[PDB]
Amino acid sequence: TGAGTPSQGKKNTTTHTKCRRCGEKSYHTKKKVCSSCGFGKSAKRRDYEWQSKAGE
Amino acid sequence: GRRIQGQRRGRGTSTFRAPSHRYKADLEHRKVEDGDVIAGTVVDIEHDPARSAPVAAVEFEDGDRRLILAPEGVGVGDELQVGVSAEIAPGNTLPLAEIPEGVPVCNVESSPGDGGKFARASGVNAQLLTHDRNVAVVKLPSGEMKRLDPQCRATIGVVAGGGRTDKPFVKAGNKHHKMKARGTKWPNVRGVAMNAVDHPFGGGGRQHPGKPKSISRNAPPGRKVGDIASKRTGRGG
Amino acid sequence: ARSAYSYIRDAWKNPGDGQLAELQWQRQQEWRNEGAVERIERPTRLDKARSQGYKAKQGVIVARVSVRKGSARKRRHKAGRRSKRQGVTRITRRKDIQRVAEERASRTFPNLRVLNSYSVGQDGRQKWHEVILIDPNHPAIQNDDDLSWICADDQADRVFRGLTGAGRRNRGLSGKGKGSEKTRPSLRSNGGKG
Amino acid sequence: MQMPRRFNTYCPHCNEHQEHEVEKVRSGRQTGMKWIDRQRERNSGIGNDGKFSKVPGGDKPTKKTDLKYRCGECGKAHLREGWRAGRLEFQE
RNA sequence: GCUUUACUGCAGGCUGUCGCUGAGGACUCUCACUCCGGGAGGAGGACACCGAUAGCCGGGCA
RNA sequence: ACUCGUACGGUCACUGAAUCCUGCCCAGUGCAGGUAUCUGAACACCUCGUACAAGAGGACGAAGGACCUGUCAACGGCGGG
RNA sequence: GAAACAUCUCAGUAUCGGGAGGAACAGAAAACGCAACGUGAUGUCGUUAGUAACCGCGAGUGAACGCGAUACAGCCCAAAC
Ligand SMILES: [Cl-]
Ligand SMILES: [Cl-]
Ligand SMILES: [Cl-]
Ligand SMILES: [Cl-]
Ligand SMILES: [K+]
Ligand SMILES: [Mg+2]
Ligand SMILES: [Mg+2]
Ligand SMILES: [Mg+2]
Ligand SMILES: [Mg+2]
Ligand SMILES: [Mg+2]
Ligand SMILES: [Mg+2]
Ligand SMILES: [Mg+2]
Ligand SMILES: [Mg+2]
Ligand SMILES: [Mg+2]
Ligand SMILES: [Mg+2]
Ligand SMILES: [Mg+2]
Ligand SMILES: [Mg+2]
Ligand SMILES: [Mg+2]
Ligand SMILES: [Mg+2]
Ligand SMILES: [Mg+2]
Ligand SMILES: [Mg+2]
Ligand SMILES: [Mg+2]
Ligand code: NA
Ligand code: NA
Ligand code: NA
Ligand code: NA
Ligand code: NA
Ligand code: NA
Ligand code: NA
Ligand code: NA
Ligand SMILES: [Sr+2]
Ligand SMILES: [Sr+2]
Ligand SMILES: [Sr+2]
Ligand SMILES: [Sr+2]
Ligand SMILES: [Sr+2]
Ligand SMILES: [Sr+2]
Ligand SMILES: [Sr+2]
Ligand SMILES: [Sr+2]
Ligand SMILES: [Sr+2]
Ligand SMILES: [Sr+2]
Ligand SMILES: [Sr+2]
Ligand SMILES: [Sr+2]
Ligand SMILES: [Sr+2]
C-alpha cells in the first residue's frame, strides 16, 4: 500500500474543531487542548516570541 | 546512537507493561492479631493468569472471600487453618518457628507480616533446616541458605502446578499466547542482527559481536549487554 | 540591661551547642513530617523576626518552608553542546535556597506579600526558613506607620522581582562601591553580567 | 664529549681572567605560587580548559649544554650559549 | 550518520572522605535516619539513603 | 516499569526443529576472584615554611592497577620450519 | 568568529519560566581613595577610554573613580529606657 493517495482514504477522524475560547479550528477533540490558544492546557493564552522576528 | 531495547523497557509503556487489569489477586497472607481461631473451607480452584499455577478460593469463619496460593493436593471442601497453633497439615499457614525441621514449605516471608515473597512459582519449595531462638535457616529453591526470622509466616507443602517446565512449547504460537499474559515484549531479535545505531553488537558484514560479550558491572545502561559481570562462561573447564 | 530577645539571639549564634542542640534534634523530627509550607502561629526566632519587621498584629503571617539541599537538579543536554556547556553535576543555581523558600511561601499565600525571611536550620538533606508575610488589604496594616509601605501597588509580587532583602543581597547589591559595577541598578540593565 | 671541570677563562663580573668550575644546571623546584599557577586554578572549569588541557611535548634527538660557570675567586656564576652534545662527561 | 585502545569532555557505576551523626583498629548500644507491621510492635542502625568532594572505570552520550 | 511477579521466576546475551556431535588454546583482549609485596586521590594527622595563608615534604592508604588464579556455547586463534 | 578547533567568541544574545508599573529597577555609605586641610544617596547623558583589566597573552573582550551635565530629598525600624 502506498503512503500517498491510497492512505488518504482512511482519513475520516475528527480531531481539530472550533474552539470555545478563541474561535479557531484548533481544538483537538481527543486531547481536549487547543493548538492555537492553549485552551485546555493553560489559563494563560498561548503566545510565543518566535511567532515574530526577533527584533519585532 | 539510539536507546537500546532495555532502555525503552524502563519507561513503562503499554508494550512493556503487564496486563494488570486482567489479573485476579495479589496473593498475600491473612492478617491475624494472635491466637489461632481462623479457619476456612476451599470453595473453588481457579487459574491465575499471572503465574500459570493454580489458585485456591477460600471462605473464612468471619465471612472473608479471598484467593490464596494453592499447594499440592488441596481440593474443594478441604479445611485450612491460619494462625500460630495451626495444624501441621499441607496447605496451612503458620510461622517458621512452629513448623518442624525437614518439612517442604512455600510462600515464605522476608520480613514478618509482608504476605510471602519466596517460593511462589509452579512446583517449587523452600526447605526448613535449622532452628534457634534468633534464626530459622531456610533453603530456597535456588539452593541458597537464607537465614530468616522465626516469626516469618509460610504455607506448608510444595506449590501446585509442578512439572510445567518439563513439556516443550513446540510452536511459536504457544509462546505468543503465554507472553501476551505476562509483562514481556516478545519476540526477541538478537543484537547481533541489528544495526550499529541500535545495539552495541549491531553492524558488520557478518553477524558477530563487536567486542567481547562479558561486560563490567560498572557499565552504563546502554552498554550493559551480553554477559553481565560473568564469573565465567562456557560449559567446559 | 540585656533584653530577653538578646538571649534567643545569642542561642542561635551556635545552633549546635547547648539547649538549642537538643531542641533542634527534637523539633526537626516533627518538621520532617510536616509539609513544604507550614503556617505557624509564633516565630521560632522572635528577636530575628522583630528585627526583620515582624509585629504581633493582625495580618502578619509567618510560615516555615523546607527546600532541598545542594546544587541544581538539572537535566543533561539532549542536543549538541560544546564541552563547556556539557555540565550536569557541578552546576549550581543563581538563586540561593532562602529565595526559593520565600517564593514557595508567597505562592501558597497569593494575597500576602513577603516582608522577610530567616534560617531556622538544616539536616543532611533539606534546609528550613521561616518567612514573614504581610496582608496589604487588612486595615490593621493599612494604618500601621511602620508596615503600610507594603500596601502600594508597586509592591505587588515583590519577591518574584527580587525586591526582598534576600533578593537584593543575592543580586549583588550589598556594596555601594567597588565590585558593584554590573549589579546596580539592576542585573538586566547591565546585560546580565552580575 | 669530554669537558674539563676547572679551567681558566673570562669572568664578566670580575672583569679579568680567573679559574672557573663547570657544573650542570640542576632544576630548581617550583613554588606553585607564580601567576601561571593561579591562572590554571582560575581558568579551569567544566569541559576543556584550553591551554591547560594540553600535555607536554616531545624531545629533540640531542639537547644543548645547560651549564653554569662558577668563578674561583668571587664565587659568582655566569651563563653561556650551549652547544649540541649527546653526552657531556667531566674531567676530574 | 556510524566506529574505535583518535583528541577532549559529559552522564553513569565502583571507592575514600565531610555533613546528616548519637551513647558506651577492633567492638558494644540506641535516640536520629531506613524498612516491615493495621496496630502493638518488629528488623536495621549511626551504617544505609540524601547533600558535597576525591580517585578509578566510563563511545552509554557530546 | 518489571510487579496482582519471586529462581518451574525474569532480566541480559548467543545459537537456531529433530538426529549424530560439538576437539585443542587462558599468551593478548574481556569479565570475574584473590593479593605478602609494589603502586594508588582528597579529608584529617605529623615536618618545614608564613606572627596567619599560599607552598614544599612525610606518614596512612580505598577502589583500581601491578602480580596470581578461574573462564572460550567470551572476543577470538588452531601456522612457519 | 578564531580563516581547522577544544578555552575564548557569537552571548548572558535567541528562546523559555515567573512578575510589576505607567514607567520599572536603584537609593541616603561597614561609599570613594584625582591619599586629601578632599568628595558626599540613586539613576541617566557627555567624557574619562578602547584607558586599566582579561585572553590558545591568539582572535578578541573591556570597566571604574573623577569630571561636565540632568534632576535633586531625605527618612522609618529593631534594641536600650
Ligand atoms: Cl517463558
Ligand atoms: Cl511577595
Ligand atoms: Cl649539560
Ligand atoms: Cl573626589
Ligand atoms: K562553539
Ligand atoms: Mg501477591
Ligand atoms: Mg526456555
Ligand atoms: Mg503483550
Ligand atoms: Mg531471535
Ligand atoms: Mg541489517
Ligand atoms: Mg555505539
Ligand atoms: Mg551466523
Ligand atoms: Mg555468529
Ligand atoms: Mg562548533
Ligand atoms: Mg534602568
Ligand atoms: Mg514504605
Ligand atoms: Mg562521536
Ligand atoms: Mg538464520
Ligand atoms: Mg570557523
Ligand atoms: Mg590561531
Ligand atoms: Mg564579554
Ligand atoms: Mg572606583
Ligand atoms: Na503573593
Ligand atoms: Na560576575
Ligand atoms: Na576568574
Ligand atoms: Na549521513
Ligand atoms: Na587467553
Ligand atoms: Na574559518
Ligand atoms: Na569542520
Ligand atoms: Na581565552
Ligand atoms: Sr482508520
Ligand atoms: Sr493539561
Ligand atoms: Sr508567552
Ligand atoms: Sr502490603
Ligand atoms: Sr507480597
Ligand atoms: Sr557487530
Ligand atoms: Sr570444552
Ligand atoms: Sr498580583
Ligand atoms: Sr573561574
Ligand atoms: Sr576541566
Ligand atoms: Sr623526536
Ligand atoms: Sr585471560
Ligand atoms: Sr544631593
Domain C1-194 classification at class level: alpha beta
Cis (ω within 30 of 0) for the bond into C185?
yes
> Which residue does chain C place closest to D49, by CA atoms?
C84
Range of the domain at D53: 1-92
Q: Give the method used.
A: X-ray
- Alpha-carbon gap, residue B60 to B83, rounded angstroms: 12
Are C and D close enough to touch, i.e. 3+ CB pairs under 8 angstroms? yes
> In terms of Cα–Cα distance, which of B197, B224, B217 is closest to B7?
B224
B59 grid coordinates: 471462605
- Alpha-carbon gap, residue B165 to B142, rounded angstroms: 15
Which residues 82-111 on chain C approach chain D with CB closer than 8 angstroms? 82-87, 90-91
| Number of domains chain D is built from | 1
For chain B, which residues make up each domain, given as ranges? Answer: 1-78, 82-159, 160-237
Residue B110: DSSP 8-state: S
Domain B82-159 has CATH 3.40.1190.20: no
- Distance in Å from E29's C1' to B143's CA comes to 35
- C33 nearest nucleotide via C1' and CA: E33
Partnered with residue D6 across adjacent β-strands are D21
The CA distances from residue C95 to C71, C163, C171, in Å, are 11, 13, 9
Which residues numbered 51-90 in chain C sit less than 7 A from strand E, measured from CB?
Answer: 68-71, 76-77, 79-83, 86-90
- Alpha-carbon gap, residue B144 to B165, rounded angstroms: 21
B84 grid coordinates: 500460630
Range of the domain at A43: 1-56
Are A and D close enough to touch, i.e. 3+ CB pairs under 8 angstroms? no
Cis (ω within 30 of 0) for the bond into B95?
no
- Alpha-carbon gap, residue C15 to C6, rounded angstroms: 15
Residue A11: DSSP 8-state: -
Nearest protein residue by Cα to C1' of nucleotide E40: B33
Radius of gyration of chain D (CA): 19
3-state secondary structure C124-192: CCEEEEEEEEECCCCHHHHCCCCCHHHHCHHHCCCCCCCCCHHHHHHCCCCCCCCCCCCCCCCCCCCCC
* Cell 533584653 found at: C3
E chain positions with any atom within 7 Å of a protein CB: 1-5, 8-14, 19-21, 32-33, 35-43, 49-53, 56-62
C24 grid coordinates: 533542634
Tally Cβ neighbours within 10 Å of residue B204: 12
- Asked whether residue B62, judged by its CB, lies under 7 Å from any atom of the DNA or RNA strand E, the reply is no
CATH code assigned at A34: 2.20.25.30
D66, D23 in Cβ contact below 8 A? no
- Asked whether residue B231, judged by its CB, lies under 7 Å from any atom of the DNA or RNA strand F, the reply is yes
Partnered with residue B227 across adjacent β-strands are B214
Partnered with residue C60 across adjacent β-strands are C134
Considering every ligand atom, which ligand is closest to the CA of D57? 41
Number of Cα atoms under 13 Å in the Cβ half of residue B232: 4
Centre of ligand 11 to C-alpha B196, Å, is 6
Q: Give alpha helix (H) positions in chain D.
A: 35-43
Centre of ligand 18 to C-alpha B193, Å, is 10
Number of Cα atoms under 13 Å in the Cβ half of residue C136: 18
Tally Cβ neighbours within 10 Å of residue B69: 25
Q: Identify the three-state secondary structure at position B99.
A: coil
Instruction: Spell out which residues of chain C touch residue D46, defining contact as CB-CB under 8 Å.
Output: 83-87, 90-91
- Alpha-carbon gap, residue C119 to C114, rounded angstroms: 15
- Distance in Å from G24's C1' to C86's CA comes to 36
* PDB resolution in Å: 2.8
G chain positions with any atom within 7 Å of a protein CB: 6-9, 12-16, 18-22, 24-33, 41-44, 55-58, 63-65, 76-81
Q: Identify the three-state secondary structure at position D33.
A: coil
Residue positions counted in chain D: 92
Give C161-170's long-range contacts (Cβ < 8 A, gap of 24+): C162/C99, C164/C99, C164/C102, C164/C114, C164/C116, C164/C117, C165/C52, C165/C116, C166/C96, C166/C98, C166/C99, C166/C102, C166/C116, C166/C117, C167/C99, C167/C102, C170/C94, C170/C95, C170/C96, C170/C98, C170/C99
B69, B51 in Cβ contact below 8 A? no
B1-78, CATH topology level: OB fold (Dihydrolipoamide Acetyltransferase, E2P) (2.40.50)
B225, B199 in Cβ contact below 8 A? yes
Centre of ligand 10 to C-alpha B191, Å, is 10
Helical (H) or strand (E) element with B4? none
B224 grid coordinates: 550493559
Question: Distance from D10 to chain C by nearest Cα, in Å?
Answer: 56
